[PDB]
Write a protein that binds this ligand. Structure first.
Ligand SMILES: [Zn+2]
Lengths: 244, 443, 215, 293, 299, 267
RNA sequence: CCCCGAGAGGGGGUUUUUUUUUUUUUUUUUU
């Protein structure tokens, strides 16, 4: 029971968007050159994410070294000031966070060509400065951008998106208010394809609605891929112009 | 700042502070400014070209009639834009089948009504949802439209910004509907709006005070009766005071019972107390109705019938619990706040004693409610002779400290007494029974 | 509650009670802990506050982590039986103490070795019917005694003093300073504090040498 | 006199001839005849890029040159590295790549040079000859299967570094050349490692004899007699290198000396770390190059 | 401690999949036969899937609810691994990738989903409540830990019975089972997990840019099949035809329609499993009642 | 320390810095700071925020959040939380800086806690969260500048209800939109390096490695204030220092601090 | 398979300890 107009009869949402529109998606490449080999600053809505890629480099412990592939590590730092109400405890060892880190690794292990970087380590540090729904999808986009900036080989883009289901209606790119009022589905889409790297459903969804929700997410993720690709060619082109 | 997007959509920052449990939270949400907000008028020939389909692939219907109620110049054909106050006060008149046919309800108004009253907001939405060929209500999302969206000026109260927002909507509607010769009338009781129009520096706008607007309609005499309106009661506490009182175990809320055998004594059911706390007196009841959720404060023990600090009040509370077990003396209290009124449309009849047949102008009369546990209400009317022997529906407006009786204004004329039509209809709606025919959306 | 300790029932609540210049003397003992290489007992009693702390030096022992031409030193303060301090505050004093003894310990004589110094704030009674500043000079005294008792080379007997929230540790007959600490206190009182602390430094150094020799 | 420069900004986290370009997953070609190189991957006829960069066509060999990435060792490169660890009969040195390079005990010129008989003892005692933290010149002798580099210092030109200061720039700003050791005005010598590691020292007799004692080729001791001007010259040269790097412009022996003399406008040296001077300096270097055409 | 898998074994098991063969002789869409055994005490349940052996134990004790939730009881699920299931598992390793995933799948399937009526665990609001604990013991590992645990937890919760409690004022009166019978728990729905394993018969290039999809997906993989898969999918449903949770945390990129097919295939399995659990619970109840009649008769 | 240098590099740097005309590797003067960039008010979710970028890539982010508390039970009204990326929460450097910073910004030491008081019973608790993304030296002064900038651009909710709990005891209610700017005087923390007999402001990474000692000196209300701490910037070259150096450092800060504050208190 | 001598010499292919769990807004039946 929600007293707010999550989806008005006029087809408008609480923030003004319609059913099908992505939130301001502003990417940023090479934000921390003196701190990492690759870096990206993501702004998807009110979400603010710093992503640092450090590597490939020498492992700090020879015990943890693979002679056939690189070691991929991801640590997500959800700051205590990410949400309106400051969290008293840290989230560093939170099971929810360990699953997120694990999830992200399992995603890019099959995309990043770790096999061509044996006896090395790729460390991915993430700092979530502000959170407002769809943080998982934003985490995916931040890593993909930062990895590319580091010149680390990968097969394709991985775009992340979230889709809510309020009653019958499907809502693209939901915020914190919408996620609190309905079940959401987080989708990671490889490139322009229909193949999902990540399918995440944590709340109840009717079996009949799931296929349609996936269809919305994939279409929306393709737009995220285009925006990421666009901003990347723009950054590339300028560098090429100035360097050459 | 404000960012422009690809769809011609804009986005800004809506930031407000909400107080919860003595806490202060800065809430910040993003606010998108669109460019495809339909006027929802049959006359319009531009909006249908820029409108887009809903999640269910359904374009919104333009319902506002191309030939609305025509009034004496310079009003002519016109649409009505409502203010927040005129909605909260005369929702009954807004449901009257004999007036308000084409009405535009701004988003900012709809939002304020939702926060101020939950119920009225539902009734207003029903009018929008339920629109037919007799009554037509829409919701123009003015806050989401880039053309009408205004932002707070330096050193400006939120109430003046919102009034300026509504006024901006009327101007936009006025300019937008010029080729169709349809003017817009702003029905508002607010003092503030007029000054901005008296200068008329930027644009013109026709605004009538609720009463002033009614006096411009063809059926003014038929709908004027629906216009909402040392003795002194102790003022109710401010809102902050009772919330802290409940939290500090000083004040207590519950449902009050008032018997028809005695209107000068009430009793509240409190969880902390075994036997119901009595409320003796008319000042102590403080304009409370039977079934109302009231907040009461325990009177001193010397007021008991058969303090300064909060500490003493909690001690008084304990002495009250002891006294209830002893069954010798019983604790009394006084209502200082009304949490939830049990008010609903009330059926009654004019008392022949308070109406003068010789009077031709407007006069004050009394109406005897069908509820024997309820007091009588004062009514301003001119058709006092036409409502003499009839079952009428009235709604309360206010019951302030300096008036011995609550004040109410008539809503509808059910009929003559002891007739099968009037008595059956009064019988149904007194027991909350919807007898109206099923809406089009239902059928 | 905890699966490694017995902390009792969770609904239990700790017992809370209700209501119904000055000369300083200290006692010194060394080498009473067979478990380690060097140890010291420092007890001080003055006015409305007495302190009994124990220091223990473990080293030089093996270092797994890295090659080193010189030695590596670590200092950890532990809360005692009743009086308690913030972990942050104990870490801060530990860092302050590390800087001091990295100026005194002849690290060159201990390649790829580790000298781990523990100071137990065993019994700190507050009888007044940042208090950590008054314990600092006694810590330095204990660590100096323990290191000397362990046989760890020292450039000079490092001692200290405290005056109005200001703590300063001296070496070389008070000619130079190996550490400066200041919390609260007043303004432009540096010169007065240095003199008062040097007096305590001199007294502590004499008693330390007297303890390392005669005992 | 200004105590500090602080640049402020509100409401924002941060400030904000045709060459082919491509992103990961983009289709480069559909000609199966091509031999796919680095930065690419293929499936039947389709060849896709494996990195963000420019498409390169050399003969029949299609490859995509990345925009960004660490220094990639090639055989014969002149690099400057720091000893990370010492184990067995080898030295592992930090070059700035994906992996540490190796430096076998065999390659280095032992004390007494050729005359001294090969010694069992030296392998045990190598730390004394070299140890963790030491800087040195080295040439990439060979390459391992993964791409790691094996170094050697079997020359008088190569060896332990001293009498100066270290600084580093992105390896992309330093390319291969006939020689990476250069003599500059002010009696100082630069060593421009291809890996981006740069060593600025006082010009030695060897540096002079290059364009015109074997027991002390691994000594840490700085020259006892190093003048302030030589020291103040080093500081000036180092800042200008950082300035060239700040403009993302590759360093040149000519660019360095040109900047060094052009920077003489500013009295105090500590005035070469500021951005305005660097921005203006960078443009000065570039306009002259344009004039040269 | 690693499990060494030869190239020969890797190539064989994968090639067998290309020929519609799996070593245990099952069908790509075939779920293992689930055997459920109840102990003497309520809440004691043993689940067996082929060689996979898991044991769950439900327990409860009087406790005080959190300040935030004065009307809700406490409920926790423990799934600590041990070297008993195999030396591959480190003792107490509760931060490993697979461990945290499994822990999170169960939590989102039972805890978060509200399978257990925590509101009915409250005795006196904001004072005293029941604290239900589900302890899963991984005895023998042959894959399908997530599916085995979800069944073990649910079967246990539905089989468990808590002792009657009467409360007056502060005092709590815990009635022993013999004096009065114990009370069952409140189950809002019955969540069942079905795990899919994905295999790429070709190379990564044909998975990313390949036209026709050829990735193989099997239901409820054994240990050998689990060690050679390229992607995992765990989908949880109930008889009410609703998805409780879906988790494809990375791995081999898979076609969306194929993932939907898996969800529909899993629904047919969870239906058979749910009915199976209910039947074994009825017979267990009939067994305990028949013995109670034979105990009273002779008595 | 952080940076790894050879014995030769350290000897050259030390001799250059220990010289009577002290020669800095970048050519700076013993009182010149390196250029920094500061961003503020970029976290709308928080009451205040800042981001400082050094010349060596060192980056620190500070967030300011508020909470209504009973000042009769909550002794500390300003809590500093430090998080250095790549370090454990219980690391020695982290806790030391955390303990130090909390003393620098105590309620009744270097901060006007009167501006945090709402009523006779309730006051505003200020949470200063520090996030060090990257740092190559002792980040204590870096964090200090960021906290300063953040606290000078912080906006708190405005009270509506009466300010006398003792009698009427009204529940704390605040205005829906208006916020009052936090007027306060944040202290600054300067760090110095001791190389021989010379004292350097804003020690670089390479400079700190060869330094004999160091000083941490706080600054508030136009004067030197506690906490004042001597600190070993490295651990291989730590030596005792003459008292006149300590007095020189305090004097050095006392004359160059207002210049820093002036460039930092810009409108 | 890899580096150094012109011809069956020599040198390398990379192993081991440190620090606990929560988590977002007046009965009954037909009417
Ligand atoms: Zn229109």
């Amino acid at each position: 029971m929600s007293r707010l107009e999550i989806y008005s009869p006029e087809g408008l949402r609480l923030d003004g968007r319609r059913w099908n529109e992505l939130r301001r998606f502003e990417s940023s490449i090479n934000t921390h050159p003196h701190a990492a080999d690759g870096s990206s600053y993501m702004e998807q809505g009110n979400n603010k994410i710093i992503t640092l890629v450090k590597g490939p480099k020498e492992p700090r412990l020879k015990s943890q070294m693979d002679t056939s592939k690189a070691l991929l590590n991801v640590s997500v730092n959800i700051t205590k000031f990410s949400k309106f109400e400051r969290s008293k405890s840290s989230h560093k060892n939170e099971r929810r966070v360990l699953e997120i880190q694990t999830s992200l690794v399992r995603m890019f292990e099959k995309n990043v060509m770790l096999n061509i970087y044996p006896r090395t380590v790729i460390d991915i540090e993430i700092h979530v400065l502000e959170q407002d729904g769809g943080i998982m999808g934003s985490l995916i986009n931040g890593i993909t951008l930062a990895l590319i900036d580091a010149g680390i080989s990968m097969f394709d883009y991985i775009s992340g998106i979230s889709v809510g289901l309020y009653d019958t209606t499907p809502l693209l790119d939901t915020n914190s208010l919408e996620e609190n009022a309905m079940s959401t589905v987080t989708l990671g889409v490889v490139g322009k394809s229909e193949k999902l790297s990540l399918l995440l459903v944590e709340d109840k969804i009717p079996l009949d609605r799931l296929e349609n929700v996936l269809a919305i997410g994939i279409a929306g993720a393709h737009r995220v891929r285009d925006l990421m690709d666009e901003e990347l060619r723009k950054h590339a082109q300028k560098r090429v112009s100035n360097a050459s | 700042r404000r960012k422009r997007l690809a769809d011609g959509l804009s986005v800004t920052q809506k930031v407000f502070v909400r107080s919860r449990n003595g806490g202060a939270t800065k809430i910040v949400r993003e606010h998108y400014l669109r460019s495809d907000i339909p006027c929802l008028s049959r006359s319009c020939t531009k909006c249908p070209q820029i409108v887009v389909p809903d999640a269910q692939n359904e374009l919104p219907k333009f319902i506002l009639s191309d030939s609305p109620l025509e009034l004496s110049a310079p009003i002519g054909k016109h649409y009505v834009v409502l203010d927040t106050n005129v909605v909260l006060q005369a929702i009954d008149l807004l449901e009257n089948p004999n007036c308000f046919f084409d009405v535009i309800v701004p988003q900012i108004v709809l939002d304020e009504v939702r926060n101020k009253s939950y119920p009225v907001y539902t009734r207003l939405r029903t009018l929008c949802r339920d629109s037919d060929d007799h009554k037509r209500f829409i919701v123009f999302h003015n806050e989401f439209s880039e053309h009408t969206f205004v932002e707070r000026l330096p050193n400006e109260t939120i109430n003046d910004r919102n009034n300026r927002a509504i006024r901006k909507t009327c101007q936009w509607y006025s300019e937008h509907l010029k080729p169709y010769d349809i003017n817009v009338v702003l029905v508002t009781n607010d003092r503030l709006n007029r000054e901005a129009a008296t200068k008329e520096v930027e644009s013109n706008i026709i605004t009538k005070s609720l009463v002033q607007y009614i006096e411009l309609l063809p059926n003014a005499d038929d709908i004027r009766d629906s216009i909402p309106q040392d003795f002194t009661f102790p003022e109710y506490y401010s809102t902050a005071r009772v919330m802290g009182g409940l939290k500090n175990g000083v004040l207590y809320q519950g449902n009050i019972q008032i018997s028809e055998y005695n209107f000068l004594e009430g009793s509240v059911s409190l969880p902390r107390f075994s036997k119901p706390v009595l409320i003796v007196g008319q000042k102590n009841l403080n304009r409370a109705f039977n079934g109302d959720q009231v907040i009461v404060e325990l009177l001193p023990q010397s007021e008991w019938k058969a303090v300064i600090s909060d500490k003493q009040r909690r001690l008084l509370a304990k002495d009250a619990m002891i006294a209830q077990r002893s069954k010798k003396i019983q604790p009394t209290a006084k209502v200082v706040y009304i949490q939830r009124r049990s008010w609903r449309q009330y059926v009654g009849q004019l008392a022949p004693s308070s109406v003068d047949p010789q009077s031709s102008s407007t006069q004050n009369v009394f109406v005897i409610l069908m509820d024997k546990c309820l007091p009588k209400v004062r009514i301003r009317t001119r058709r006092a002779a036409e409502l003499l022997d009839k079952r009428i529906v009235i709604s309360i407006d206010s019951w302030p400290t300096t008036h011995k009786y609550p004040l109410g204004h008539f809503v509808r004329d059910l009929g003559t007494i002891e007739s099968a039509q009037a008595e059956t209809e009064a019988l149904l709606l007194e027991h909350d029974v919807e007898y109206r025919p099923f809406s089009k959306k239902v059928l | 509650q905890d699966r490694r300790r017995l902390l009792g029932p969770a609904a239990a609540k700790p017992m809370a009670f209700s209501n119904t210049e000055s000369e300083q003397e200290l006692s010194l003992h060394t080498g009473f802990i067979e478990n380690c290489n060097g140890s010291a007992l420092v007890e001080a009693r003055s006015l409305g506050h007495q302190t009994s702390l124990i220091s223990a030096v473990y080293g030089p022992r093996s270092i797994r982590g890295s090659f080193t031409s010189q030695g590596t030193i670590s200092i950890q303060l532990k809360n005692g039986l009743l009086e308690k301090y913030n972990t942050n505050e104990l870490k801060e004093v530990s860092s302050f103490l590390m800087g001091i003894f990295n100026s005194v310990v002849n690290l060159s004589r201990y390649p790829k070795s580790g000298i781990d110094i523990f100071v137990y704030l065993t019994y700190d009674k507050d009888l007044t019917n940042s208090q950590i500043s008054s314990l600092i000079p006694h810590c330095i005294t204990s660590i100096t005694l323990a290191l000397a008792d362990a046989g760890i080379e020292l450039v000079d007997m490092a001692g200290a003093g405290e005056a109005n929230g200001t703590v300063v540790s001296f070496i070389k007959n008070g000619e130079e300073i190996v550490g400066f600490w200041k919390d609260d206190g007043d303004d432009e009182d540096l010169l007065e504090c240095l003199d008062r602390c040097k007096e305590q430094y001199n007294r502590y150094r004499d008693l330390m040498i007297s303890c390392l020799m005669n005992q | 006199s200004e105590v500090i420069t602080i640049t402020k900004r509100n409401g924002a986290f941060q400030n904000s001839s045709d060459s082919q370009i491509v992103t990961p997953g983009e289709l480069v070609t559909d000609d199966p005849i091509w031999m796919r190189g680095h930065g690419t991957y293929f499936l039947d006829n389709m060849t896709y890029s494996s990195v963000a960069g420019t498409v390169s066509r050399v003969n029949r060999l299609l490859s995509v040159i990345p925009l960004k990435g660490r220094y990639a060792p090639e055989t014969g490169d002149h690099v400057v590295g720091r000893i990370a660890e010492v184990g067995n009969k080898r030295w592992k040195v930090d070059i700035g790549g994906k992996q540490h390079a190796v430096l076998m005990l065999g390659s280095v010129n032992l004390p007494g040079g050729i005359l001294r008989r090969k010694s069992e003892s030296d392998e045990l005692q190598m730390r004394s000859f070299l140890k963790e933290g030491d800087l040195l010149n080295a040439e990439v002798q060979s390459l391992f299967q993964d791409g790691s580099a094996s170094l050697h210092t079997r020359s008088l030109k190569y060896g332990k570094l001293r009498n100066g200061m270290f600084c580093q720039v992105p390896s992309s700003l330093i390319v291969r050349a006939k020689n990476h050791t250069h003599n500059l005005p002010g009696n100082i010598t630069v060593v421009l490692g291809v890996n981006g590691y740069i060593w600025l020292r006082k010009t030695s007799q060897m540096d002079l004899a290059r364009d015109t004692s074997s027991w002390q080729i691994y000594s840490d001791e700085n020259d006892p007699s190093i003048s302030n001007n030589i020291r103040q010259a080093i500081c000036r040269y180092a800042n200008v290198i950082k300035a060239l790097a700040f403009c993302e412009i590759g360093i040149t022996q000519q660019r360095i000396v040109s900047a060094y003399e052009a920077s003489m406008v500013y009295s105090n040296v500590g005035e070469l770390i500021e951005k305005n001077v660097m921005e203006s300096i960078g443009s000065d270097i570039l306009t002259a190059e344009k004039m040269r055409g | 401690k690693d499990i060494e898998i030869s190239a020969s074994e890797s190539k064989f098991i994968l090639e067998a999949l290309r020929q519609n063969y799996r070593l245990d002789g099952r069908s790509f869409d075939q779920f293992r036969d689930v055997e459920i055994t109840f102990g003497k005490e309520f809440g004691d349940v043993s689940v067996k899937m082929g060689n996979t052996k898991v044991h769950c134990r439900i327990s409860c004790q009087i406790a005080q609810p959190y300040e935030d939730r004065p009307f809700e009881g406490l409920f926790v699920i423990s799934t600590e691994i041990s070297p008993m299931a195999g030396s591959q598992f480190e003792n107490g390793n509760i931060t490993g990738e697979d461990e945290v995933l499994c822990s999170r799948i169960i939590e989102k399937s039972v805890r978060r989903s509200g399978a257990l009526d925590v509101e009915g665990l409250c005795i006196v609001a904001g004072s005293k409540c029941w604290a239900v604990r589900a302890d899963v013991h991984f005895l023998d590992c042959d894959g399908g830990f997530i599916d085995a645990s979800c069944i073990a937890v649910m079967a246990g919760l539905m089989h468990f019975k808590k002792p009657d409690i009467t409360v007056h004022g502060e005092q709590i009166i815990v009635h022993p089972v013999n004096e009065r019978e114990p009370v069952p728990l409140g189950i809002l729905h019955i969540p069942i997990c079905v795990t899919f394993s994905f295999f790429n018969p070709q190379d990564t290039e044909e998975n990313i840019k390949g036209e026709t999809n050829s990735e193989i997906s099997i239901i409820d993989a054994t240990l050998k099949e689990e060690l050679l898969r390229d992607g995992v999918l765990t989908v949880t449903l109930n008889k009410n035809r609703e998805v409780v949770q879906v988790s494809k945390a990375g791995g081999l990129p898979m076609d969306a329609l194929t993932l939907m097919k898996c969800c529909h295939e899993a629904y047919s399995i969870i239906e058979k499993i749910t009915d199976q659990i209910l039947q074994l619970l009825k017979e267990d109840s009939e067994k305990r009642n028949k013995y109670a009649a034979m105990l009273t008769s002779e008595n | 320390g952080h940076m790894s240098l050879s014995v030769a590099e350290k000897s050259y740097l030390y001799d250059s810095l220990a010289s009577t005309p002290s020669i800095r590797p970048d050519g700076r003067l013993p009182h010149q700071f390196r250029p920094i960039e500061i961003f503020t008010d970029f976290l709308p979710s928080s009451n205040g925020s800042s981001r400082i970028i050094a010349s060596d890539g060192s980056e620190c982010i500070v967030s300011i959040k508020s909470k209504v508390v009973d000042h009769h039970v909550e002794n500390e009204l300003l809590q500093v939380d430090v998080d250095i990326a790549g370090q454990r929460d219980d690391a020695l450097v982290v806790e030391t800086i955390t303990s130090l910073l909390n003393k620098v910004l105590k309620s009744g030491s270097g901060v006007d806690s009167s501006k945090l008081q709402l009523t006779k019973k309730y006051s505003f608790k200020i949470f200063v969260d520090v996030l060090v993304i990257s740092s190559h030296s002792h980040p204590i002064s870096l964090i200090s500048f960021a906290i300063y900038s953040a606290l000078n651009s912080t906006y708190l909710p405005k009270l509506i209800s009466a300010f006398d709990d003792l009698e009427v005891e009204e529940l704390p209610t605040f205005h829906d939109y208006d916020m009052v700017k936090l007027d306060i005087n944040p202290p600054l923390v300067f760090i110095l390096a001791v190389v021989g007999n010379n004292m350097l402001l804003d020690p670089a990474a390479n400079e700190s490695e060869v330094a004999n000692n160091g000083l941490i000196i706080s600054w508030s209300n136009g004067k030197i204030t506690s906490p004042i701490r001597s600190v070993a910037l490295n651990d291989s070259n730590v030596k005792s220092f003459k008292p006149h150096l300590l007095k020189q450092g305090l004097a050095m800060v006392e004359k160059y601090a207002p210049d820093v504050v002036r460039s930092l208190e810009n409108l």
